Design a protein around this motif. Sequence first.
Motif, PDB file in Angstrom:
ATOM      1  N   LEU A   1       0.835  -1.195   0.000  1.00 62.08           N
ATOM      2  CA  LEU A   1       0.000   0.000   0.000  1.00 62.08           C
ATOM      3  C   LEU A   1       0.877   1.255   0.000  1.00 62.08           C
ATOM      4  N   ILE A   2       1.964   1.222   0.773  1.00 66.59           N
ATOM      5  CA  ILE A   2       2.918   2.332   0.898  1.00 66.59           C
ATOM      6  C   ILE A   2       3.729   2.583  -0.381  1.00 66.59           C
ATOM      7  N   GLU A   3       4.018   1.511  -1.116  1.00 65.57           N
ATOM      8  CA  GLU A   3       4.768   1.637  -2.367  1.00 65.57           C
ATOM      9  C   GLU A   3       3.940   2.316  -3.433  1.00 65.57           C
ATOM     10  N   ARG A   4       2.736   1.791  -3.676  1.00 61.27           N
ATOM     11  CA  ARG A   4       1.849   2.325  -4.708  1.00 61.27           C
ATOM     12  C   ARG A   4       1.663   3.837  -4.543  1.00 61.27           C
ATOM     13  N   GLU A   5       1.472   4.261  -3.295  1.00 62.82           N
ATOM     14  CA  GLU A   5       1.337   5.681  -2.973  1.00 62.82           C
ATOM     15  C   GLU A   5       2.608   6.471  -3.258  1.00 62.82           C
ATOM     16  N   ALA A   6       3.732   5.995  -2.725  1.00 65.06           N
ATOM     17  CA  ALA A   6       5.039   6.593  -2.993  1.00 65.06           C
ATOM     18  C   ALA A   6       5.281   6.773  -4.503  1.00 65.06           C
ATOM     19  N   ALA A   7       4.859   5.796  -5.292  1.00 70.13           N
ATOM     20  CA  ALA A   7       5.013   5.905  -6.727  1.00 70.13           C
ATOM     21  C   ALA A   7       4.046   6.955  -7.269  1.00 70.13           C
ATOM     22  N   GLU A   8       2.796   6.902  -6.813  1.00 71.63           N
ATOM     23  CA  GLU A   8       1.770   7.904  -7.137  1.00 71.63           C
ATOM     24  C   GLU A   8       2.205   9.355  -6.838  1.00 71.63           C
ATOM     25  N   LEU A   9       3.410   9.514  -6.297  1.00 76.43           N
ATOM     26  CA  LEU A   9       3.918  10.795  -5.822  1.00 76.43           C
ATOM     27  C   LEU A   9       5.357  11.084  -6.268  1.00 76.43           C
ATOM     28  N   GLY A  10       5.952  10.174  -7.041  1.00 74.42           N
ATOM     29  CA  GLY A  10       7.315  10.361  -7.547  1.00 74.42           C
ATOM     30  C   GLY A  10       8.371  10.100  -6.491  1.00 74.42           C
ATOM     31  N   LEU A  11       8.034   9.218  -5.556  1.00 72.56           N
ATOM     32  CA  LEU A  11       8.920   8.797  -4.471  1.00 72.56           C
ATOM     33  C   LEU A  11       9.140   7.283  -4.499  1.00 72.56           C
ATOM     34  N   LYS A  12      10.314   6.863  -4.049  1.00 72.42           N
ATOM     35  CA  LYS A  12      10.570   5.446  -3.827  1.00 72.42           C
ATOM     36  C   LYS A  12      10.544   5.209  -2.316  1.00 72.42           C
ATOM     37  N   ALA A  13       9.762   4.235  -1.879  1.00 70.02           N
ATOM     38  CA  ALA A  13       9.659   3.967  -0.452  1.00 70.02           C
ATOM     39  C   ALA A  13      10.183   2.588  -0.143  1.00 70.02           C
ATOM     40  N   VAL A  14      11.127   2.536   0.788  1.00 64.95           N
ATOM     41  CA  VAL A  14      11.631   1.265   1.287  1.00 64.95           C
ATOM     42  C   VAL A  14      11.086   1.000   2.694  1.00 64.95           C
ATOM     43  N   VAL A  15      10.185   0.037   2.764  1.00 65.84           N
ATOM     44  CA  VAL A  15       9.485  -0.245   3.985  1.00 65.84           C
ATOM     45  C   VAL A  15      10.055  -1.514   4.612  1.00 65.84           C
ATOM     46  N   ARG A  16      10.773  -1.395   5.731  1.00 72.33           N
ATOM     47  CA  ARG A  16      11.207  -2.576   6.495  1.00 72.33           C
ATOM     48  C   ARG A  16      10.720  -2.631   7.965  1.00 72.33           C
ATOM     49  N   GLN A  17      10.675  -3.846   8.528  1.00 70.61           N
ATOM     50  CA  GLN A  17      10.225  -4.109   9.895  1.00 70.61           C
ATOM     51  C   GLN A  17      11.137  -5.084  10.634  1.00 70.61           C
ATOM     52  N   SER A  18      11.613  -4.703  11.812  1.00 72.71           N
ATOM     53  CA  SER A  18      12.336  -5.637  12.662  1.00 72.71           C
ATOM     54  C   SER A  18      11.714  -5.737  14.071  1.00 72.71           C
ATOM     55  N   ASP A  19      12.216  -6.676  14.876  1.00 74.66           N
ATOM     56  CA  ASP A  19      11.948  -6.717  16.314  1.00 74.66           C
ATOM     57  C   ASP A  19      13.203  -6.343  17.098  1.00 74.66           C
ATOM     58  N   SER A  20      14.320  -6.215  16.388  1.00 74.51           N
ATOM     59  CA  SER A  20      15.596  -5.943  17.042  1.00 74.51           C
ATOM     60  C   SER A  20      15.949  -4.468  17.050  1.00 74.51           C
ATOM     61  N   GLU A  21      16.158  -3.960  18.257  1.00 73.36           N
ATOM     62  CA  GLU A  21      16.718  -2.627  18.430  1.00 73.36           C
ATOM     63  C   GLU A  21      17.964  -2.422  17.533  1.00 73.36           C
ATOM     64  N   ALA A  22      18.831  -3.438  17.485  1.00 70.03           N
ATOM     65  CA  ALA A  22      20.084  -3.383  16.717  1.00 70.03           C
ATOM     66  C   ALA A  22      19.796  -3.099  15.246  1.00 70.03           C
ATOM     67  N   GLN A  23      18.894  -3.905  14.690  1.00 63.52           N
ATOM     68  CA  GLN A  23      18.496  -3.836  13.302  1.00 63.52           C
ATOM     69  C   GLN A  23      17.940  -2.459  12.999  1.00 63.52           C
ATOM     70  N   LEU A  24      17.116  -1.909  13.883  1.00 65.54           N
ATOM     71  CA  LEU A  24      16.574  -0.554  13.697  1.00 65.54           C
ATOM     72  C   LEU A  24      17.656   0.522  13.749  1.00 65.54           C
ATOM     73  N   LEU A  25      18.483   0.473  14.797  1.00 64.73           N
ATOM     74  CA  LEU A  25      19.522   1.470  14.984  1.00 64.73           C
ATOM     75  C   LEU A  25      20.311   1.501  13.701  1.00 64.73           C
TER      76      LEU A  25
END
Lengths: 141, 138, 141, 136, 141, 137, 141, 141, 136, 141, 138, 141
Positions: free
Chosen positions: F29-53
């Motif tokens: 859903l986030i990609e289609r919108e980002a494209a609809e706006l001339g943006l590239k969106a990279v959407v990632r999800q972790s459970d690790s503080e390390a991975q986020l930092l």
Amino acid sequence: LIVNVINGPNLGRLGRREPAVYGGTTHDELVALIEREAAELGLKAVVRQSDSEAQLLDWIHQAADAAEPVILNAGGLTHTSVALRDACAELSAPLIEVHISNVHAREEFRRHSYLSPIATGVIVGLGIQGYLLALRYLAEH
Amino acid sequence: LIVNVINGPNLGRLGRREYGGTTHDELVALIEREAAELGLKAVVRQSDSEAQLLDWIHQAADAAEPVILNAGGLTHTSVALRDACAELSAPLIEVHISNVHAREEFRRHSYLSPIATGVIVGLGIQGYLLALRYLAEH
Amino acid sequence: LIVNVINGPNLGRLGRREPAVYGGTTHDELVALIEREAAELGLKAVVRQSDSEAQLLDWIHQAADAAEPVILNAGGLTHTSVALRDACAELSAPLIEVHISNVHAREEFRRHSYLSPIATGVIVGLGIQGYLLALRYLAEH
Amino acid sequence: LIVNVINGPNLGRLGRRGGTTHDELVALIEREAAELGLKAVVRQSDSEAQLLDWIHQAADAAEPVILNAGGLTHTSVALRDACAELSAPLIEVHISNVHAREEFRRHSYLSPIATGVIVGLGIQGYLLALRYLAEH
Amino acid sequence: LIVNVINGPNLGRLGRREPAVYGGTTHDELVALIEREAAELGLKAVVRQSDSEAQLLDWIHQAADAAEPVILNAGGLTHTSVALRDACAELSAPLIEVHISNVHAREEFRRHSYLSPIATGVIVGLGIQGYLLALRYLAEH
Amino acid sequence: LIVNVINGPNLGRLGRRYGGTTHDELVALIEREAAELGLKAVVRQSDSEAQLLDWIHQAADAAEPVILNAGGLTHTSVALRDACAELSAPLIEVHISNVHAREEFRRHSYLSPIATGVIVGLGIQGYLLALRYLAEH
Amino acid sequence: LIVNVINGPNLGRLGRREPAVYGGTTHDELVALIEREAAELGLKAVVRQSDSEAQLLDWIHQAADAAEPVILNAGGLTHTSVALRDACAELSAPLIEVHISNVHAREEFRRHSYLSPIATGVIVGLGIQGYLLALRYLAEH
Amino acid sequence: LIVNVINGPNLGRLGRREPAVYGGTTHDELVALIEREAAELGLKAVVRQSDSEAQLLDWIHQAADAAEPVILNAGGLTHTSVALRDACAELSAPLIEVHISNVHAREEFRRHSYLSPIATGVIVGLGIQGYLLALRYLAEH
Amino acid sequence: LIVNVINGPNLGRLGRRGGTTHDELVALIEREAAELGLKAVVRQSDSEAQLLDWIHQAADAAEPVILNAGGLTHTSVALRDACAELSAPLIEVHISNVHAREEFRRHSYLSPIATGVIVGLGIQGYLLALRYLAEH
Amino acid sequence: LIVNVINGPNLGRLGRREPAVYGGTTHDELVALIEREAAELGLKAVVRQSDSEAQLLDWIHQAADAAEPVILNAGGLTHTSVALRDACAELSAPLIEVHISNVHAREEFRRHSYLSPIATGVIVGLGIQGYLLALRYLAEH
Amino acid sequence: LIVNVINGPNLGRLGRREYGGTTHDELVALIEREAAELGLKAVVRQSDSEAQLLDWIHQAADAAEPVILNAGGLTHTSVALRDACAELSAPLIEVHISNVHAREEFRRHSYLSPIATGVIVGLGIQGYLLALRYLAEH
Amino acid sequence: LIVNVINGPNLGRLGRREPAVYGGTTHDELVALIEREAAELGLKAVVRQSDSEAQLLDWIHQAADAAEPVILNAGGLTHTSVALRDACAELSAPLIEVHISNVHAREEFRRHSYLSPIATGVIVGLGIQGYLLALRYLAEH
Ligand SMILES: O=C(O)c1cc(NCc2cccc([N+](=O)[O-])c2)cc(C(=O)O)c1
Ligand SMILES: O=C(O)c1cc(NCc2cccc([N+](=O)[O-])c2)cc(C(=O)O)c1
Ligand SMILES: O=C(O)c1cc(NCc2cccc([N+](=O)[O-])c2)cc(C(=O)O)c1
Ligand SMILES: O=C(O)c1cc(NCc2cccc([N+](=O)[O-])c2)cc(C(=O)O)c1
Ligand SMILES: O=C(O)c1cc(NCc2cccc([N+](=O)[O-])c2)cc(C(=O)O)c1
Ligand SMILES: O=C(O)c1cc(NCc2cccc([N+](=O)[O-])c2)cc(C(=O)O)c1
Ligand SMILES: O=C(O)c1cc(NCc2cccc([N+](=O)[O-])c2)cc(C(=O)O)c1
Ligand SMILES: O=C(O)c1cc(NCc2cccc([N+](=O)[O-])c2)cc(C(=O)O)c1
Ligand SMILES: O=C(O)c1cc(NCc2cccc([N+](=O)[O-])c2)cc(C(=O)O)c1
Ligand SMILES: O=C(O)c1cc(NCc2cccc([N+](=O)[O-])c2)cc(C(=O)O)c1
């Protein structure tokens, strides 16, 4: 230079009420006394009073717009209105909070002021003479 | 009518390092002249020592003489000063040069304010003159 | 390079006793231990002790006029003296706060400092040698 | 004697908004270590789990620790606990003066169970930690 | 009925420390004790420990997916992790918080748990025995 | 013109007990919108503080903007805040639910004082609206 | 070994209504189960209930003088009574605090206990079974 | 579909006062900007502003009986007004609290709100576009 | 056999706006202490540094102390630390009931480390505290 | 002239547990000592103890009716019982609060008393002599 | 129709007050007559014993009788009371003779008010009469 | 004999939404009951409602000047308004605070009132009858 003195809730009942707390000079009488003293100082003073916060804000916008200083005694609003403080934050010219009574020898909640941190200065507990001393500071800048 | 102006610690370092402007010896002359001009006699003394302040506040008590006081940092720390001052029959006026309610949160409370006749904050060296004036009338 | 070490209330009776929370070293042997390390790094350390808050202020005053750096261990005053904080605020040159004991192990009133926020840095609970460590900071700037 | 220098999350970012990268500090420490006859093992991680294992290892081997834990200094009981087990001296270190900053940075979980604390003496504070250990 | 026993950070170090706290049993023996009691009570038990939050979060997710009860001792995490609490709140089955030591007699910061309010029950300060009492609760429901 | 959308602990579990819609539906859903706006969106999800930092460090170095929904870490991790403070590009905090209608502990956020702006309680569109603010910077 | 189970105010009301906060078991039925369970464990259980604080003090006094363990659910007194704390302090045998309902899932005032910091352990939320579990702790001393 | 966009005290000064945040767009323009955006989405946006708490109350009363959505920037009142909160709770259509600046990044007293716990959701620090943003949410849901 | 009775700031002002003056107080204390088998040195200062010196001397001499530190009770961490050192008994006396007064008077840095405190029993507090010292 | 010495909860157990803290003197030795002391001074001491709050109330009521002076060591109820304070405020005669131990060196919750603010005075930490010293104040008035 | 009027600690002492001028004995007669005038029966009891209070509250709970309670100091200190009272299914009215909001800080919180139907404070002994009048109508 | 019943913000919409927390009876119906009842007591009630703090202060000034008593339900301003407290403080006739709902069963911000400490008394939670039970008190003096 014009200098606005603005008095908040209940202050239009000065003298007739609470003479042992706020002195016996009435508000009609306060105006005259301050008008007379600005004149003598080479200043002109617009002294006004309201029980409505909306009115107070309007007079504050007016002063902020004229680059006029402001001597303010918000009565109880001092410790309750974020709305008031936001309005006085526009003021380029100096801002002097005045309170006839010594807010600090009184209830606990009168000891915190949303206005004090954004004011040039504050005068408290010097009676009605607190307005005149405020004019004096302004007349010298 | 003799009026006591008392300045707490660090106030001997006035002027030197920036507000205004004016030095201590200067402030002494402004106030002293202004006072007489109002028909008053003013002694102005500064001290870095709590005991010296307490002594002056005692002498003024005995003498029923009004006091004007910038105690400084001791405003926020000293119960002894506060109790010294409570004795006063003549008006006591708290003066602070800077606007303390716009500073660190610990200068936002004063042990002196609730036993003082009045408080004047944020009006610079002029504060003292305004306190002097209030005294001239009462 | 003239480093100032100031010691406030109670530190005068170091070693002497109590000696278990602060350790064996006397106040005089402290002076001498510093005076030597002062040489070993090339500075001329002045060490002084007073129980009188006022002396301390007079000494912080001098160091400010002279633009000399300060190592300070102001006994309990750390936690109760705004005036001591204020006078220290004036220092162009760096201010290192040193406490012999780890004040964060001790009572809670000992865990806030008025001096800490206006100091260059703080050394705590490294014993008597912490004074020396902070002499070495001044060597390096 | 092997002193452990452990560095918490974000400290690998050293030198960016002291231009001293982490990698450079490792060299300034290791020099001074030996310029005093000690071996300093300097490590960094963004993982709480990792740092906890490092402190385990120091616990199990009576080695001194110099700790700048960064954020976790104010958040982590699990870190407080593990450092409690260290029999050898623990010296908490922070490059910036944490007291000059936000209130939440003024409380440390580590400080009360630590031997000593060095704060806001920049990066030379790590080095001073060693000189103290140098005297044992 | 499969039951989950999860232990947080530092809990692999059972055996050390203090032997005063805590007690004598190593994690291994505890694991072995739990399995013994679980079979004896007619249930299968899976005891895992990690010092890693994300690791503990996954073990919880799987228990949510599988509708398995959890007996949880999160170490410090009890007092610090919203993530873990959030994750446990998804458990449809019972959740029993267990601590070995008496957290109400220790540091004020340990007297608050993020888990307690969403747990089914809590047993504290009863040593290693606590897990086996939790176990018994689960077997009767 | 790339936008990092980072979701934190637990948000992997979306759609199975925020709102309906899975995580997989979300990224989509986030990609289609980002494209609809001339943006590239990279959407990632972790459970690790390390991975986020780590992802935060990368956005910092690359001067990319971040839409962050840190889960519970919003209210616990000073570590996450310091990394976010490094960012030179906008940082937009997002929450699906209204964090001010829930438990007290969820009503203070270590990130908000250093973020550009916050969006709470407008569900999944909360992410969509955030990208669109980035579109006009 | 004699073991004392003591229930504070309101706990005589158990089972009737019947709350889904506490079980459907009456306080009589609770006695039966405990004494029964204790017999199976080879302990001797005396289970008593009162609305009178002073009477619970007397029973604690009596437990102290005979050096017998105490299972205590003081009801709300947990949260308000220093007197109960002081009386429980003198026990040499264990003292295990027991609540039927999970008191961390409830209102704020129920989340501090004057007793917890001096008890051996605490069981909360496991219902009537918590008393039986505390028995097991005690049977294993 | 009618949507009410309601602005509180001091929002009449929008654009004329400190632009760092709140920007350089006057209130008149915003109404134009909001009005245009609504056309684009097939909405009718009534945009209004008052310094009068009683005027705000009346407008919110009306939105309730009509069951119209409300986008609200109550200025200071957010933090000081219970009357406002109560009227707002009374709405059955969604209520998006919008603030131009990042409230959470200023003074602590701007960090607590009365409206938020009864708002659908809240948008902060995204400048004047928050209002356009809140409209979009309303257009879909 | 020596007891130290040390009086803090403002107490040199006694009897002047209570009734009994400080010179009467010493007179009272000295006699009563004589009547008890003790010798009492009653000193009074507005100076914090002097009180410290008087407490130091007493810690050194292992002599008990009776202390009305005045306001210094609620502000001085220094004074408290000085008194922590005392090995013989330390009794805190206040002439007035400090608990029926202002909020800041209901906390003492001293009490937590005194043998005990006597409050609100006027001038007799001093004598009463001399009587705890006769018995020990 | 009759003096009322009233002791609260747990004080019956004086001289038994906790010889450190409370002393080696028993309650019976206490009742006797206080009695001999009264004689020597010209007073008649009536000493009572109870674990029952309603009883202490009764006693204070009785002292109030007779306009007799009260020396009260309320045990825990000092920190908990508003009802106790209320009964005490009714006393015309002096009321001297006494605690055997130095409450200000123990748990924070003992550091604050409901009675102290309405007592003539308080004597704390002087052990059992504190009762005789109170007596002796009442002998001079 | 039975109404329980329960008076807590210290209230046996009204009239030797400081709180009106009427006595407990007298107040029992006031209440009873007004209740009867209102088509009701009031049982009025006072005790200094919390345990006693719980019993009466237990009884009025089991009887589903309404309660007018003035719990004295226990209002601020007893969870056991709060708990006992939560069980009542008929209205509970908390009454106090004096304005509690105008006194000490500790008097401004109550364990009962949150689970009372309503509260009446400051209106004297008359507070009891109005409480009855509410129960009379519902 | 005039009695002023004055209702604050939002109270105009009595009856309409709610009818759960304070409700069923409309404001007009309310005005009628109070009047019908005031007469039967030998009083005359003036019942006015307003959303405006200024107006409310104006009516208190009038009661204050006339020495008439006031039954006041200020609504939200109960908790927020110093100026209303100061205005109420000038009344010489009894002031009685009324609230339809039980303000202590609700949010914490509602559990503190600025006027209770300066009122004669308060009735809370008895709904509409509160007003009628308040007139009744006034009729007795
Ligand atoms: O709430 C305050 O801090 C406050 C309120 C007020 N309220 C104005 C006021 C209150 C009661 C009575 C009158 N009056 O003039 O009759 C005026 C005044 C003052 C003061 O000037 O020192 C301070
Ligand atoms: O903390 C205070 O309330 C305080 C302390 C002080 N301390 C004296 C002082 C501190 C720093 C610098 C100077 N000086 O005059 O160069 C003087 C002054 C003032 C003031 O009147 O603005 C206020
Ligand atoms: O208030 C403090 O944190 C504090 C007070 C003090 N007090 C000085 C002191 C008190 C009692 C005894 C001694 N002494 O020298 O034996 C010295 C020292 C230190 C320290 O260097 O760790 C810290
Ligand atoms: O902080 C807590 O609530 C807590 C933490 C922990 N932390 C685990 C831990 C910390 C330090 C050392 C060990 N260990 O097994 O040596 C284990 C345990 C317990 C407990 O089971 O009572 C409670
Ligand atoms: O603690 C918070 O502020 C918080 C935590 C979370 N945690 C994520 C989460 C927790 C439990 C379950 C799920 N899920 O998607 O099933 C997701 C989300 C949100 C939000 O965006 O409103 C806010
Ligand atoms: O205040 C508490 O923490 C508390 C109070 C009580 N109060 C006793 C009680 C209150 C209401 C009803 C009953 N009952 O058994 O009918 C008993 C119980 C419990 C519990 O066992 O979980 C906890
Ligand atoms: O810090 C205090 O609470 C305190 C301060 C003081 N200050 C000493 C003092 C202050 C003003 C006047 C006098 N005096 O000479 O009567 C004495 C006394 C007392 C007391 O003995 O009750 C208590
Ligand atoms: O809670 C208190 O402040 C308190 C309680 C008590 N409780 C009485 C008490 C507790 C434990 C043991 C005994 N006793 O007589 O063996 C007596 C005493 C004292 C005291 O006299 O210092 C102070
Ligand atoms: O703690 C209270 O709010 C409280 C306590 C009490 N305590 C009863 C009481 C205390 C002292 C003296 C008396 N009396 O009968 O003179 C009565 C009464 C009242 C009241 O009825 O307004 C309110
Ligand atoms: O916050 C309060 O103390 C309060 C506020 C209010 N607000 C007035 C109000 C709010 C929402 C709705 C209505 N109404 O009459 O539709 C009236 C009422 C009451 C009450 O009468 O119980 C109490």
